[PDB]
Design a protein around this ligand. Structure first.
Ligand SMILES: NCCCNCCCCCB(O)O
Ligand SMILES: NCCCNCCCCCB(O)O
Ligand SMILES: [K+]
Ligand SMILES: [K+]
Ligand SMILES: [K+]
Ligand SMILES: [K+]
Ligand SMILES: [Mg+2]
Ligand SMILES: [Mg+2]
Ligand SMILES: [Mg+2]
Ligand SMILES: [Zn+2]
Ligand SMILES: [Zn+2]
Lengths: 346, 343
């Protein structure tokens, strides 16, 4: 087929937390280093293309998307947590409930809650460094496409699409897709589209660009009435101000198969075609998989070949940022199938 | 003289886990709290002890929303039916920039209705919250019908609960429910004074736009402690309620000699308000040995607190809130009542 380059960090376990709050218990996290190891091993076994390590871009490009206070918090959170004498990993306990003030406090517990949307995303040693590397993985891929590649695969871990300008959660810290999209904008690309095919709503990407018409954000996902993130992702969220009609949410119910999901994909592709962007960022999750342990769609591994083919037909410079997908048995087959279908396999 | 209302049903709330510092720990708000106070009440022969009357959900719903009362009744069953294996703890909530919109899934509802993940729900939590509100309402009834004061030995506590938010070990706001009951019975003005170490954010929120119920709280600086996002001194009310909320904040290590200066400020605000009845949300987590709080009151200081409260000369309902050193919790709480009665 064709060839696609993949950017990856060799330190798969830089982020290495051991707890995630789930169903009232502290379990082993779903977003585990073996996710990245397994995808990388399938990239190599399939000879998808060249594999390279990220360039360091520093925090400059990260701060085009995230606030300075938030970027500082994530760097110091673990140290401050340990210094306050807590014995577990860093998990929020308290937050800005409805009727309370969106006011940044001093105490580390208060700041953890202020900056989070969920308690599923433990922070420990290495988390800051891992988030930085994953952002650099996305920016290296963006650089590859800007300098001539049709597409590149940013093997991001941790993922990013739930991260707001200053809110972390859903296993995400820095919004890698939004950082790559904004990097395209900063490099003179007039219009960028961000298409979120992870099972969950990309609420962070929607929020970051919500009042802007230069970045079109679209997400297909399970009904937030039923699943995370619960409080964004509904189809009536179409943008605000100049961003009115430049956000599109497409929602599906439990057990949705490719035959139906692909109708939503076609709707998203039509919206992209009318927008006529200059580059495309695909926030790629394969938690739409029929065996994914926390999601309820029914795509088969062969469906990811079809997804990649349909994405290529859009005809755009394309960066893929890796998001979710938690059946590690099949994560490599599924994610690399998208790249292979984009490159002509099917 | 002073009567105490106590429900043995409080023990139906007996959770095994509390999220604290990233770990699931033995909960601080444990059944021995109410039992140790009750044993001191009997040992000191403070007064008659009675069980609550059943007032139904009506008076509860004068303060809390109907959806929220409904949620608390079914939350545990819904949680078990969705296949969760632990106790019921919220994982996701309305983060900043998200919609305050009620979803269908149990996880989404838990987050919508909560302000923290420290308050696990399990079987019997609903029953105990109901009985605790009836304890407060029975104490209010005793006062309204002639008693100078009454002790509502509530467990679980209430002062962190908003009209439709739970957290901080609280589900129904027992103090607010008794306050609203005074108002519904023709008491023109009511004051609620919160001496628990933490801010009574639930009580503040419930009456925040009202001038007929004056809410005052002394507490540790929320920049430093729970509940973090309310309780600052610039929160004075809104609409008709501006100047009818007063927060008095203190830093770590504050002793009674300083804390009681804030108490005097509170009492003068009450004196000028001139209420027809007073509700005291009584926590003894201001105690020098409290495991989660940073004030330095002594057991003897609680006698001084109770005496000062009596000098306000008002019909007074005490609702039990916090206090987590179980060794001294009985001595401390009953010291307030005894200092009130003249000890
Ligand atoms: N395990 C809890 C169910 C919902 N939580 C999912 C975590 C964040 C979404 C993951 B993703 O790939 O967007
Ligand atoms: N344990 C960590 C501090 C925050 N948790 C306290 C919750 C409120 C209970 C205290 B009460 O008596 O008002
Ligand atoms: K999505
Ligand atoms: K937009
Ligand atoms: K207080
Ligand atoms: K008020
Ligand atoms: Mg703290
Ligand atoms: Mg399998
Ligand atoms: Mg759920
Ligand atoms: Zn996902
Ligand atoms: Zn307290």
């Amino acid at each position: 087929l064709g060839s696609m380059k993949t950017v990856f960090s060799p330190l798969h376990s830089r982020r290495h937390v051991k707890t995630e709050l789930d169903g009232g218990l502290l379990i082993e996290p779903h977003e585990k280093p073996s996710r990245a190891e397994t995808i990388l091993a399938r990239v190599k076994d399939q000879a998808l293309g060249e594999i390279l390590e990220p360039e360091e871009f520093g925090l400059g490009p990260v701060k085009r998307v995230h606030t300075a206070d938030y970027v500082s918090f994530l760097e110091t959170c673990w140290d401050e947590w340990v210094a306050a004498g807590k014995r577990g990993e860093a998990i929020p306990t308290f937050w800005v409930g409805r009727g309370m003030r969106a006011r940044l406090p001093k105490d580390i517990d208060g700041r953890l809650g202020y900056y989070s949307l969920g308690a599923d995303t433990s922070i420990s040693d290495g988390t800051w460094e891992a988030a930085r590397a994953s952002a650099n993985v996305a920016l290296t891929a963006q650089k590859l496409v800007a300098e001539g590649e049709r597409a590149a695969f940013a093997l991001c871990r941790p993922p990013g699409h739930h991260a707001h300008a200053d809110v972390f959660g859903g296993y995400c810290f820095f919004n890698n897709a939004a950082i790559a999209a904004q990097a395209f904008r900063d490099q003179g690309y007039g219009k960028v589209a961000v298409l979120d095919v992870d099972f969950h709503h990309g609420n962070g990407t929607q929020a970051i660009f919500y009042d802007r018409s230069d970045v079109l954000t679209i997400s297909l996902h399970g009904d937030p009435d039923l699943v995370f993130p619960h409080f964004l992702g509904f189809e009536d969220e179409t943008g605000e101000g100049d961003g009115e009609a430049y956000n599109l949410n497409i929602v599906f119910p439990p057990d949705t198969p490719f035959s139906i999901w692909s109708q939503g994909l076609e709707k998203a592709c039509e919206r992209i075609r009318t927008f006529a962007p200059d580059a495309l960022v695909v926030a790629l999750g394969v938690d739409t998989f029929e065996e994914d342990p926390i999601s309820f769609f029914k795509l088969t591994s062969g469906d990811y070949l079809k997804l990649g083919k349909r994405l290529e037909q859009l005809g755009l410079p394309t960066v893929f940022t890796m998001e979710g997908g938690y059946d590690v048995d099949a994560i490599g087959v599924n994610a690399v199938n998208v790249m292979q279908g984009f490159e002509g396999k099917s």
